[PDB]
Amino acid sequence: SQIRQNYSTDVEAAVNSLVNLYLQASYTYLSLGFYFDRDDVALEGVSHFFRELAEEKREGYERLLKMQNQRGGRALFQDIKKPAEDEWGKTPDAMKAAMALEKKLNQALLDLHALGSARTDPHLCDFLETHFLDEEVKLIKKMGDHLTNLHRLGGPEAGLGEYLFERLTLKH
Amino acid sequence: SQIRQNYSTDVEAAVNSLVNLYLQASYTYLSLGFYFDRDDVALEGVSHFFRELAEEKREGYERLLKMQNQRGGRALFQDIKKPAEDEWGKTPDAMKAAMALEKKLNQALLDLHALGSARTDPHLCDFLETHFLDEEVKLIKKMGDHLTNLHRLGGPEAGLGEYLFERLTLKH
Amino acid sequence: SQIRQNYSTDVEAAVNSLVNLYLQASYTYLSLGFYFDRDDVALEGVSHFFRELAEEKREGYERLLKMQNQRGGRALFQDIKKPAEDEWGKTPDAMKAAMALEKKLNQALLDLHALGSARTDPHLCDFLETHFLDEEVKLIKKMGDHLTNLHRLGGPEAGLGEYLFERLTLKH
Amino acid sequence: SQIRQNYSTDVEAAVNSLVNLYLQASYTYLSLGFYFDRDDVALEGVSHFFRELAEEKREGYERLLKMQNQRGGRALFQDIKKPAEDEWGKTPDAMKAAMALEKKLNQALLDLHALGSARTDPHLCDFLETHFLDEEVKLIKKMGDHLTNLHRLGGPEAGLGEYLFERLTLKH
Ligand SMILES: [Fe+3]
Ligand SMILES: [Fe+3]
Ligand SMILES: [Fe+3]
Ligand SMILES: [Fe+3]
Ligand SMILES: [Fe+3]
Ligand SMILES: [Fe+3]
Ligand SMILES: [Fe+3]
Ligand SMILES: [Fe+3]
Ligand SMILES: [Fe+3]
Ligand SMILES: [Fe+3]
Ligand SMILES: [Fe+3]
Ligand SMILES: [Fe+3]
Ligand SMILES: [Fe+3]
Ligand SMILES: [Fe+3]
Ligand SMILES: [Fe+3]
Ligand SMILES: [Fe+3]
Ligand SMILES: [Fe+3]
Ligand SMILES: [Fe+3]
Ligand SMILES: [Fe+3]
Ligand SMILES: [Fe+3]
Ligand SMILES: [Fe+3]
Ligand SMILES: [Fe+3]
Ligand SMILES: [Fe+3]
Ligand SMILES: [Fe+3]
Ligand SMILES: [Fe+3]
Ligand SMILES: [Fe+3]
Ligand SMILES: [O]
Ligand SMILES: [O]
Ligand SMILES: [O]
Ligand SMILES: [O]
């Protein structure tokens, strides 16, 4: 590139990888989104929650792609692996799947910050600090709070709790 | 003071004491406030309730400090004792702790009115009558009502009741 | 915590410590605030300056407590040590006390950034960088400017300078 | 009176006395007001301060007269004693005269509250508590603050301080 400066081939390839990971997470959220709208699941607020996460994740990869172009990197796409399940169980299960996905995304973000820090790339570090890390922290805190409210509503009287949580906590 | 008039050294020192008591109650409410926002407690409305009480208590001590200055008293600060617990249990427990704290504040207010009455200080008596006593009565009535609603929602099906009360009674 | 990730027990405890330090500074500012409103001190603008600092410091600890909850830390409170003086002298003295307090807060902030940097916690580093460090720099620069204006107004004609500075520099 | 109830002849006569005292204070403030507008005194803000006090004191006696009528008392007027001085010196002197007058008014108010308390007349006590006592406290605190600012501006460079205080503190 006529423009590339302080932009290591390692960051470029790790950014390409994080992009595939965002694409895959978006895809997972899409699947959870339509799943909770099945006539036999029918939890509109849960469906909305996950549709919104698919949308947020898309913004993630679009922003990584834009930063790749701005630094003089070359985007390279791989296949997007289908989501890990085709049925997602009940709200607690789905929510725990989502937690696990967000934890993996967060680790991948932290790993890429560590790497850019190690290649003294402060622009890349700042970029992640600004557009990604706090977003992850806030979102994980929110899923944790959700898991705590579902747990409190679970046990013997499981079905009623799931209805109430979707109705009184999730936006529909 | 060039300004002090009918202001006994006893009232002045008791006002200093009530100030430390307000500081301490504010501090207790702060602690209850963040506690109910822990990812493993996650009761936003309860957290809001107690944050608001911390704020109200701060107004209390600021008003006592201002009246101290207006009467020609000298403020004197002591250490603020940390709250009595670091974990606050469930909503009923926290609410009973709050009740007990408010009852102690009310007794301390009544005691200071008695004392100013005994030093024939009608300004101090009126000041408490106007800015403190009815506030205490209204607030204790509210915590009592809350305790009655939690009791009605308690027993075997404890977790569900706590969710509903936070959702349908507390402002979030 | 179901949510904690990359959050060292050292940062958590140092955050708890910084919280007690903010509580203590807020308390010091409260004391300076009412002091300058005594009928025998009577410098409304100075009183306003310090009341505002008490308020800002409270925002500080509330933000640290919120970040503690978001990271999955557990808040732990200690006693709040009373302010170091009960009488604060003249504006120059108070202002130098405030400078010293802000310098200690700044060092404690820098130390905690160093520590999170050493535990490769970029979220914590960014958090301080964003909500604390520049605030400290701006405020210390402002107290320094104030000290320079008081010095210029001091010396033989001390009392007049203190009146003018409160009237023509501080917001009342 | 067809209306009088729980209204002792002692309160009635003490209310008549407090009225003459308010009339006299109003008269004193009138005198201080025009004095500071003499071409050879020429302190507009000081003049305004005292004119305003004359006005406030008039409201005082009008309110006592109205309450006398409402309780079924009979107003009785005596002569109004001329003010104690015809020349009032400099701002510090006038302000100390005003302080002394307000202290005497406050004592007379406290004495009348004590008396109505002793005749178990809660209406009269409340009336004073509501329309008089806090007004006195606030005003004395304000004169004290003023005296502190004048003192700080006094000494060798007396004339300049008096100009600045009238210009930068008093409303003109
Ligand atoms: Fe959307
Ligand atoms: Fe969105
Ligand atoms: Fe967005
Ligand atoms: Fe969007
Ligand atoms: Fe399957
Ligand atoms: Fe950085
Ligand atoms: Fe509030
Ligand atoms: Fe409030
Ligand atoms: Fe309020
Ligand atoms: Fe408020
Ligand atoms: Fe414990
Ligand atoms: Fe009353
Ligand atoms: Fe009253
Ligand atoms: Fe009363
Ligand atoms: Fe403010
Ligand atoms: Fe502020
Ligand atoms: Fe602020
Ligand atoms: Fe603010
Ligand atoms: Fe001392
Ligand atoms: Fe940064
Ligand atoms: Fe930054
Ligand atoms: Fe007027
Ligand atoms: Fe008026
Ligand atoms: Fe008026
Ligand atoms: Fe008026
Ligand atoms: Fe004379
Ligand atoms: O978004
Ligand atoms: O409030
Ligand atoms: O603030
Ligand atoms: O007035």
UniProtKB/Swiss-Prot annotation, chains A, B, C, D:
It is found in: Cytoplasmic vesicle, Autophagosome; Cytoplasm; Autolysosome. Coiled coil: none annotated. Gene3D superfamilies: 1.20.1260.10. Residues 52-59 are annotated as: Catalytic site for iron oxidation. One of its GO terms (molecular function) is identical protein binding. Disulfide bonds: none annotated. Residues 5-154 form the Ferritin-like diiron domain. SUPFAM superfamilies: Ferritin-like (SSF47240). Keywords: Acetylation, Cataract, Cytoplasm, Cytoplasmic vesicle, Disease variant, Iron, Iron storage, Lysosome, Metal-binding, Neurodegeneration. Oligomer of 24 subunits. There are two types of subunits: L (light) chain and H (heavy) chain. The major chain can be light or heavy, depending on the species and tissue type. The functional molecule forms a roughly spherical shell with a diameter of 12 nm and contains a central cavity into which the insoluble mineral iron core is deposited. Iron enters the spherical protein shell through pores that are formed between subunits. Mutations leading to truncation or the addition of extra residues at the C-terminus interfere with normal pore formation and with iron accumulation. It is linked to Hyperferritinemia with or without cataract: An autosomal dominant disease characterized by elevated level of ferritin in serum and tissues, and early-onset bilateral cataract. Cataracts may be subclinical in some patients. Neurodegeneration with brain iron accumulation 3: A neurodegenerative disorder associated with iron accumulation in the brain, primarily in the basal ganglia. It is characterized by a variety of neurological signs including parkinsonism, ataxia, corticospinal signs, mild non-progressive cognitive deficit and episodic psychosis. It is linked with decreased serum ferritin levels. Stores iron in a soluble, non-toxic, readily available form. Important for iron homeostasis. Iron is taken up in the ferrous form and deposited as ferric hydroxides after oxidation. Also plays a role in delivery of iron to cells. Mediates iron uptake in capsule cells of the developing kidney. Delivery to lysosomes by the cargo receptor NCOA4 for autophagic degradation and release or iron. This is Ferritin light chain. The gene is FTL.
